[PDB]
Design a protein around this ligand. Structure first.
Ligand SMILES: Cc1cccc(N2CCN[C@@H](C)C2)n1
Length: 150
């Protein structure tokens, strides 16, 4: 019973979380997942400020109100070569990665590793935070509050 959470650098508190190496997070799960990091889904303004500090990914993820990809450098296979916060407009499907926002993180680029999941609750899952540098933090718990996400 294991969940891998790949996480990034934070940029003005905003970071990306990919679950189990595939688009697998629902909007309800995303809010619960960010809550386990004492975080919330970023607002569009928070995400735009993170972008300005150096944040970009090549993956769709929830923010408050939309599913987006922050892009700095145009890449044909990431958000159809767009720059800025690219907003997904048309999709059949509901599961993506998520972004999270931690107000207590540093104001600009923070590329230290994540070493805690501070607000997970008691539960049976081995949750492993996987940093981009491969360092890992694991803890037994749960963060999903909606049965349909389990
Ligand atoms: C990955 C990285 C490393 C150092 C700086 C940086 N940014 C500075 C602010 N603006 C961004 C376009 C780029 N991004």
């Amino acid at each position: 019973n294991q969940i891998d959470l790949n996480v990034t650098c934070r940029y003005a508190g905003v970071f990306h979380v990919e679950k189990n190496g595939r688009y697998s997070i629902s909007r309800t799960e995303a809010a619960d997942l960010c809550q386990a990091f004492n975080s919330t889904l970023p607002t569009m303004d928070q995400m735009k400020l993170a972008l300005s500090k150096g944040f970009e990914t090549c993956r769709y993820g929830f923010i408050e109100g939309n599913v987006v990809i922050p892009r700095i450098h145009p890449n044909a296979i990431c958000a159809a070569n767009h720059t800025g916060v690219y907003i997904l407009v048309t999709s059949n499907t509901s599961h993506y990665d998520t972004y999270c926002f931690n107000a207590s993180a540093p104001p600009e680029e923070d590329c230290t590793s994540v070493t805690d999941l501070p607000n997970s609750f008691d539960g049976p899952v081995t949750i492993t935070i996987v940093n981009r540098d491969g360092t890992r933090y694991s803890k037994k718990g749960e963060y999903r509050t909606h049965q349909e996400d389990i």
